[PDB]
Amino acid sequence: SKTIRSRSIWDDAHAMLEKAKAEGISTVWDRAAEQTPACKFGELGTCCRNCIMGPCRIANRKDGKMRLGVCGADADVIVARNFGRFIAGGAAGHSDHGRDLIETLEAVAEGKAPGYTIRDVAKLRRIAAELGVADAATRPAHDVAADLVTICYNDFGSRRNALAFLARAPQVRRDLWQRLGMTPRGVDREIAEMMHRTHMGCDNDHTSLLVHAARTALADGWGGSMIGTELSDILFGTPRPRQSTVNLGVLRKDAVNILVHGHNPVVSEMILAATREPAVRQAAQDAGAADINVAGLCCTGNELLMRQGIPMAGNHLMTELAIVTGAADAIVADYQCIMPSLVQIAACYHTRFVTTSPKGRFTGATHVEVHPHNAQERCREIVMLAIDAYTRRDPARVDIPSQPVSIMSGFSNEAILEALGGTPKPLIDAVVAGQIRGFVGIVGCNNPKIRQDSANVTLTRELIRRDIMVLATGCVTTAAGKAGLLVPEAASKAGEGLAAVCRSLGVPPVLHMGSCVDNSRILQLCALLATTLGVDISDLPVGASSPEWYSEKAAAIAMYAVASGIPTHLGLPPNILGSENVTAMALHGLQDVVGAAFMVEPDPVKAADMLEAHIVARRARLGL
Amino acid sequence: SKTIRSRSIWDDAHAMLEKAKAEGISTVWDRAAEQTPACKFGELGTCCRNCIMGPCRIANRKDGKMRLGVCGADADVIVARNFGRFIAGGAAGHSDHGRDLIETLEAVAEGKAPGYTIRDVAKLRRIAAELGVADAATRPAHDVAADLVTICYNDFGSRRNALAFLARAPQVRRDLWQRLGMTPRGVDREIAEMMHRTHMGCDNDHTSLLVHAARTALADGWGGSMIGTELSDILFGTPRPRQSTVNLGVLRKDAVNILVHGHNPVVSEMILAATREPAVRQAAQDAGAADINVAGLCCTGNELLMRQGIPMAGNHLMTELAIVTGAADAIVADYQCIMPSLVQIAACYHTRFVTTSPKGRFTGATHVEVHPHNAQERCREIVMLAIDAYTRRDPARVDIPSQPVSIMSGFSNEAILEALGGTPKPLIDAVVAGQIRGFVGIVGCNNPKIRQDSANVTLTRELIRRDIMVLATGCVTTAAGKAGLLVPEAASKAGEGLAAVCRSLGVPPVLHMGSCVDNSRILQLCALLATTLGVDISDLPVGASSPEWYSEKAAAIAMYAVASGIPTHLGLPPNILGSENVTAMALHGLQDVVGAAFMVEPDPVKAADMLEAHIVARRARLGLTS
């Protein structure tokens, strides 16, 4: 099938697309084909639905009609307001995730979270001292956790002048944010102000609207996401380099396969612990299974990969196909980027679709709500439902298509610095010498409009060939993994300088740094290098790219990378092209304001050319 | 012009529409006509733009295509998510307003707000004692204010189980909210969670989404709005009954006319103070003006009316027409519902359009940013700009069309209770006796799709005829005022029972209770009556109506009225009709959950029939006669 081949570059995707077609199961690609018309105005950003004087659409007509909304708003305001709410939704996704981590650490500190502990007490004391907890090195760990909880909760209040983790940014970058009015003050406050600004008759200046969009996204990267990353390491362990596998072949015919899906490790970490209890393992053996096999999907799978080495079944557009294998006995979901089509496809088989969060409700799903105080009990119940569903699996409909590909994961900043001997100096020297010319974080998703992982893999190959080290998060993890680029042996596919540095360190040329919230690790690493060198983040030879993005969260990540001084490439444009002024601001105007701008380029080789050109220019301004 | 007559019921609007037509000035009605080819999918709520796998539209096609979005979401999820974000935008409008009041009270308590004071120390001590401030009756006033500021800020945090003012609601209503998962916890938090829930692949159940929409709106009415109302009374005075005038005739040809527009009294109160300084009045007289005349627009005008008796120039669709009079020397705006067309229309005259808030930026406006620490200085500078613009006014293009209509305003709950002798008992006795059969809060805006104020005025007349007292806020204030219903003499236009009670108290049959944020006053009054009688708010003979609404803030008000147990009528439907399940939930399903539901009815007489039917049924459940 030429159509099936055009939808992905992977054999395991192709095999399940054939199977789904033979069984009459429609997938995300089929629904994408139906929605291709949609609305030109929605794509251009020139449709407004923010009050019922409208809806209004801005058109270019010879009679001059429909140039303004009923309230008088023009294309610039309407597009900027739509883009702002788009960003606020992405920031809110990371905000609630970070807030949930605070609640969990507070529950542990109060002794009200059976089965949860502080896995990394050393990191707890370090982070707490960094944020100003008195005597964080010597006081009882639960006292220290409670004080860190109070600081993090205060960043979710309305009385701070600047977020707590913002102190990591170099002084020149904080002074710039202050002059611009971009300093993030409260994680929830910026989201709430954006919704106020975008109400009819509030903020009607596209420049003002975009400035607060930067402030809202900065409250994510230096707030919601960074709190989520650091507290997750404290609760569940700081990642260290380890080996694992990826693709649909990680599912086992002889085992109970449980796929964790969503973003929150607070649930998936306890699911994993439940599968290790003797009575639970006995129920699986009583059912005829050889073992219980947990495999990861999306960001919560990335989290289990970084901290436990749990194999990854696939990324965004693989999620439906994982059920089509016939071996998915249960999907355990929390929230974000869980396509509701999985509920209907699970109904085609024996698969149980289990929801666990009060925020992630899916009509028709089996809801076993998980909170810290009952997670150990509830996650036990959830694994038992998976074992029961295993006994109802139809063996004739099982087809696990591929053999898993080996990967190396767990490259937190702590692991990176340890690999360098404890300081960033060897990394700076390699950059100064030109063996590593720069770094690019590839952090994108999948999008049905782009052949799955074609741009992710091509861009990754292009960059490491040019001695540009790649930092991979999100869906790119599975893409780079299946291409065999996440192992130390892949240095043979990097340039001479990068290959030599990788072989001397024993690391791959592509470092897996975690989930989408773990893009905050990349902010931290950039901030560390800039502070060490005494320059701004906008002076570093760095870049960010999302070749196949789709979600509001990806746009928020791109926005706070740009606002932090990181040139950011997107494979597809956001819904803003209906305003030339907003588009020019995103592509060019922001360069004069924050020292970086967006790039839109669907050709991954041309994308690599543009990212390299920025890296080269920044190398020149550093005198290298 | 038949078209001009069809656009409003008021003579002052007709004259300015005729004037605008001859001068080639397009108004909101003209732009509404251009946008009448409104997207069907946007109107039905079945278009989703929440990711760039889309946009997606759900259609009812013969070939069965486009039944689901690319992610698999159906019409129920897509409509419920769009409505949730719609509600969050309205709640965020009130949230930021209340937050600004907290900052102003904090600035006063620290002595960093020249020209601001605690105007109502007595209410400060009462509110602070109510929320748990230790020794609020005797401690220094600035110390008490600082502790109340801390309590209010904590409601804008993420560590509360329930908002502070939620304790006003009856226990039965709080227990119901708790079981349903509707208890509002943080003013900003509920807004943020709604944006998280409506992200792709998060909340994909329309019932769950609608329940959190109720929780988000409750964080407004019992949080952002209620904090805004009470702190505004503390900072600028608790309203008491007073006389004033309304309509475009409140503008004076011989004076410098300054129109305050927006929602925040922190700015308009200092503008008024600036126009009262002797040196500023001297510059106006030196320029040839008899005086400086401040007149109000929209909610900030409602606030100046309630606390200072400052006359109101007009409501939503009058804002453009006020500049067309040719006598508007300056518009001073803060934020919310300020149409950016005013900037272009001001450019057709001498009028200065001044913005004052970092949140309300308008391209091409004159920005003089106002904060508590510099408000006294900046507002003086702003009034001077108005005097200068007055000297450039074209006398030939001036046309102030009408004579002002007298109104009575200032009916805070404190004023109502004082008129009743200090307790609600005389009011309860009148309801039990059947002289006052029920209460309806009419809280709507204007909408170009409805002839201006035709439904607002007709519904108000229908209700008071049936002995149903009307509580008026927002744009309804100007509507009821211009019809002469905001004066005690209007008791002659009410039924026999309501007229007798009004004459016994000396009050109009329509009580102006303030701005849109002051709908929290109506929540407080309903909660007080329910608590006194030992029943739920859903047992009281009450209703709420928004016959001509348009904004997200209006939908948030309607949602938290319903969620609090108040049957709420809307003249126009929200963009939800593309989902029958969501529509059925809003119109019927919610009745079984929170004891009230939405009503959509564009006929104001039928709306009065439906509101009265609920009042009668609740009267029976209380064991009262009709």
Ligand code: SF4
């Ligand atoms: S806010 Fe303005 S542009 Fe948007 S729908 Fe309302 S009237 Fe139209």
Ligand code: SF4
């Ligand atoms: S969230 Fe779902 S329905 Fe909405 S645009 Fe994205 S794919 Fe389409």
